[PDB]
Amino acid sequence: PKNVRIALVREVGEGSFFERYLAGAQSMARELGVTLLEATAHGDMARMVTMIENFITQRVDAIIIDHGRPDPLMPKIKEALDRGIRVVTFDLVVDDNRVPEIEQDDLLIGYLISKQLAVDFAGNANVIYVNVGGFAPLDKRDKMWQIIKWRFPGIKEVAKIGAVTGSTAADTQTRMEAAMKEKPEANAVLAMWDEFAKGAVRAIMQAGKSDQFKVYSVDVTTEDIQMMIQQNSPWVATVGTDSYAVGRLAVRAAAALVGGEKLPKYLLVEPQLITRQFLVDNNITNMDELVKALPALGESNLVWPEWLKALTEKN
Amino acid sequence: QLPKKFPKNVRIALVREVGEGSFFERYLAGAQSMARELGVTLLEATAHGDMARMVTMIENFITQRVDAIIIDHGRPDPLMPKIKEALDRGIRVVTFDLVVDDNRVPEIEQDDLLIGYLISKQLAVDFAGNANVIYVNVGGFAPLDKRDKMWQIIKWRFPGIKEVAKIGAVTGSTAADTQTRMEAAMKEKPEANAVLAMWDEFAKGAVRAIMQAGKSDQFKVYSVDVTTEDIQMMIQQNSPWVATVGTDSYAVGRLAVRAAAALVGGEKLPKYLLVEPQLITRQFLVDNNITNMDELVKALPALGNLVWPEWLKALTEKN
Ligand SMILES: CSC[C@H]1O[C@H](O)[C@H](O)[C@@H]1O
Numbered sequence: 001p002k003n004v005r006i007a008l009v010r011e012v013g014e015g016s017f018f019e020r021y022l023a024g025a026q027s028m029a030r031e032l033g034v035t036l037l038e039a040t041a042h043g044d045m046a047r048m049v050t051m052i053e054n055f056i057t058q059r060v061d062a063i064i065i066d067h068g069r070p071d072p073l074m075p076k077i078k079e080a081l082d083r084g085i086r087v088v089t090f091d092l093v094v095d096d097n098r099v100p101e102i103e104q105d106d107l108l109i110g111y112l113i114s115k116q117l118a119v120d121f122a123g124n125a126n127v128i129y130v131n132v133g134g135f136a137p138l139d140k141r142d143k144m145w146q147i148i149k150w151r152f153p154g155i156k157e158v159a160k161i162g163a164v165t166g167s168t169a170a171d172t173q174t175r176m177e178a179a180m181k182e183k184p185e186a187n188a189v190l191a192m193w194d195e196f197a198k199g200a201v202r203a204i205m206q207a208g209k210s211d212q213f214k215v216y217s218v219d220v221t222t223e224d225i226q227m228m229i230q231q232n233s234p235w236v237a238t239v240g241t242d243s244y245a246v247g248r249l250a251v252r253a254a255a256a257l258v259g260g261e262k263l264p265k266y267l268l269v270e271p272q273l274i275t276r277q278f279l280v281d282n283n284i285t286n287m288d289e290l291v292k293a294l295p296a297l298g299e300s301n302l303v304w305p306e307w308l309k310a311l312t313e314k315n
Numbered sequence: 316q317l318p319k320k321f322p323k324n325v326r327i328a329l330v331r332e333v334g335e336g337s338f339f340e341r342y343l344a345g346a347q348s349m350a351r352e353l354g355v356t357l358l359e360a361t362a363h364g365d366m367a368r369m370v371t372m373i374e375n376f377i378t379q380r381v382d383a384i385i386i387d388h389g390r391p392d393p394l395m396p397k398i399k400e401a402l403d404r405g406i407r408v409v410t411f412d413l414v415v416d417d418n419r420v421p422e423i424e425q426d427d428l429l430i431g432y433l434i435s436k437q438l439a440v441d442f443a444g445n446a447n448v449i450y451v452n453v454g455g456f457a458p459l460d461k462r463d464k465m466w467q468i469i470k471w472r473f474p475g476i477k478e479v480a481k482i483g484a485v486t487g488s489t490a491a492d493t494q495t496r497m498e499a500a501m502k503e504k505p506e507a508n509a510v511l512a513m514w515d516e517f518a519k520g521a522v523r524a525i526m527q528a529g530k531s532d533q534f535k536v537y538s539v540d541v542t543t544e545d546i547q548m549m550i551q552q553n554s555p556w557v558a559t560v561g562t563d564s565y566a567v568g569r570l571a572v573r574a575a576a577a578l579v580g581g582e583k584l585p586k587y588l589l590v591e592p593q594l595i596t597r598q599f600l601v602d603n604n605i606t607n608m609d610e611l612v613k614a615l616p617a618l619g620n621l622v623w624p625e626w627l628k629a630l631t632e633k634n
Pocket residue numbers: 012017091104135137138164192193194218219
C-alpha cells in the first residue's frame with residue numbers, strides 16, 4: 001500500500017548521476033506501490049535539517065538520508081529512530097547499528113581509479129586533482145588517492161581544484177582553463193565525480209589540448225559514455241555503478257526496514273572499471289548497452305526479501 | 316624470431332631475503348619449474364634476513380655476469396647501489412616485492428594495496444564495523460608496509476574497528492614465535508575478538524595459539540596468502556580461520572623467471588606486473604570440498620597470462 005510513506009532527503013541533486021538515482025528510486029517505489037516523498041537541500045545544511053524535521057512531524061514510515069554531513073544530521077537521525085521511523089543512508093556514515101549504510105564501495109573506487117592512472121603512466125605523472133572535502137564519498141576516495149601518491153611517488157599532485165556549486169561542470173571547466181595555464185607541466189586529470197570530469201574534459205577539448213592529457217574519473221551515465229567515445233577524447237577511464245540501480249536499492253532497503261526486516265549494516269554496491277577502449281571496442285553508446293556488455297553492473301542481488309520480491313511480482 | 320642468446324647459457328640469479336614457510340617454498344618451486352621449461356639455468360641465493368649477506372650475494376652474481384637478477388624482497392636503501400651497478404653492467408633486473416625508482420626494472424607484486432584493503436574490509440564488514448583486533452604485522456617489508464596502509468584506512472572508515480594490539484616479528488621461526496606472542500596477547504587483551512595477520516606464517520601461529528587455548532569460538536582470524544597447509548588448517552572443525560586473501564605463489568614464481576627471461580631476450584616489460592589476488596573464505600573451501608591448492612585453482616580459476624611473448628611461449632613448446 002501507499003500507506004507506506006518513504007521520504008528521500010538529499011543534499012545534492014545536480015547532474016545525470018543524481019537524476020538517474022532519483023529515477024531509480026521512483027521506479028522502485030512504483031513497483032512496490034508505496035509513496036515516495038522527495039526533498040532536496042542543494043547544499044544548505046540548515047535547510048536539510050528542517051526537511052528531515054518535516055518528515056519526522058509527518059511521521060513517515062522511513063527516511064533515506066542522501067549525502068549530508070554527520071555532524072548536523074546526527075541528532076535528527078537519533079530523534080527519528082527513537083520515534084519508530086526507520087532510517088537508511090546513502091553516502092553518510094552514521095554511528096548507530098540501526099542505520100544501514102549504502103555506498104558504492106568508495107574506498108575501492110578511489111583505489112581502482114587512482115591505480116589505473118598510476119599504472120597507465122608507469123608511475124610518473126603530473127596530476128591535476130579534481131575533488132573537494134566535506135562529502136562522504138569524496139573523502140573516502142580522497143584517502144586512496146593519498147595512498148597511491150605514497151606507493152607511486154612519481155605520481156605528483158600539481159593542483160587540486162573543484163567546488164560543488166550547483167553548476168559544477170560549468171564551474172570546473174572555468175577552473176580547469178586557469179589550472180592548465182598555471183600548471184603547464186600537468187598531463188593527467190583525476191576527477192572524483194563525473195560532473196568534475198565533464199568540466200575538465202570540455203576545458204581540455206576547447207583548449208585543443210586533448211593529446212596532452214589523460215582524464216580518469218568516477219561514475220558512469222549515458223552522457224559520460226557519449227563524451228568518452230568522442231574522437232580524440234582525453235577521457236580514458238571511469239569507475240562506477242549504475243546509479244539507477246543504486247536509487248532502487250535505497251528504496252528497497254527502506255521498504256524492507258518498514259516491513260520489519262533486519263538489514264546488513266553495510267550495503268556495498270560493487271563498482272566497475274570502464275575504459276574508453278572497452279566502450280569503443282564494444283560500440284557501447286548508452287547505459288542499456290553498457291549494462292548488457294558488463295553484466296556485473298546489472299546485478300540483482302541486494303535486499304530482496306521473499307515477501308517484497310513476491311509483492312513486486314503482484315504489481 | 317628467437318633472440319640470439321636463447322639456452323642453458325642464459326643464467327638468471329634469484330636473490331631472496333626470506334625463504335621460510337610454504338608460500339616462499341612454493342614460489343621457489345614455481346621459479347624452478349619455469350626455468351626448467353625455458354631450458355635456462357636458474358641460480359638461487361637466500362639471505363635469511365641478513366641484509367649485508369644480501370648485498371654480497373648480489374655482488375657475487377654481478378661478478379659472475381649473469382644475464383639477469385631477480386631481487387626478491389629486501390629493502391631499497393641497502394640494495395639500490397648494487398641494483399644500479401648491475402644495470403650499468405648490462406645485467407637485467409626485475410623485482411618481486413621491492414619498490415625501485417628506475418624505469419628499467421619491472422616490479423612484480425600481488426597488488427598488495429588491494430590485498431590489504433580486501434582482507435581488512437572483510438573483517439570490518441563481518442563484524443558490522445565493531446571489533447577488538449589483534450594486528451599481526453611488522454614494518455620493513457614492502458608487501459607488509461603496503462598492506463599496513465590499507466589497515467590504517469579501514470580503521471579510519473570504520474572507527475569501531477579498533478586495534479588493541481600489534482604483534483609480530485619475522486624470525487626464521489615466525490609461526491612458532493607468533494604462537495608464543497599470541498598466547499601473551501590474548502591474556503593482555505581479553506577483550507580482543509579478531510585477528511588480522513598480514514602473512515600466512517603469522518596467521519598459522521595465531522590460529523594454533525587460539526586452538527590450544529580452546530578459544531576457537533571467541534575469535535575470527537583474517538589473513539593473507541593461501542597454500543595447501545593454509546587450506547588444511549582453515550577447513551578444520553571449529554577453525555577460527557575464516558578468510559584469507561591471496562595468489563598462487565607458484566605462479567608468482569614462474570612469472571618472476573619468465574619476466575627475467577623476457578628481459579634477457581630484449582623485451583620491454585610493463586613497469587608494474589600485478590598478480591591479481593583473491594578472497595578465499597573458509598565457507599567457500601568447505602562448500603566445495605577444497606582440501607588443496609590443486610582443487611582451489613580449479614574451483615576458482617582466477618587463481619590460474621602475463622609476459623608470454625611469442626618467442627618465449629614457442630620456446631616452451633619445443634622443450
Ligand atoms: C558531490 S558528492 C558526488 C558523488 O556522490 C555520489 O556518491 C556519486 O558517486 C558522486 O560521484
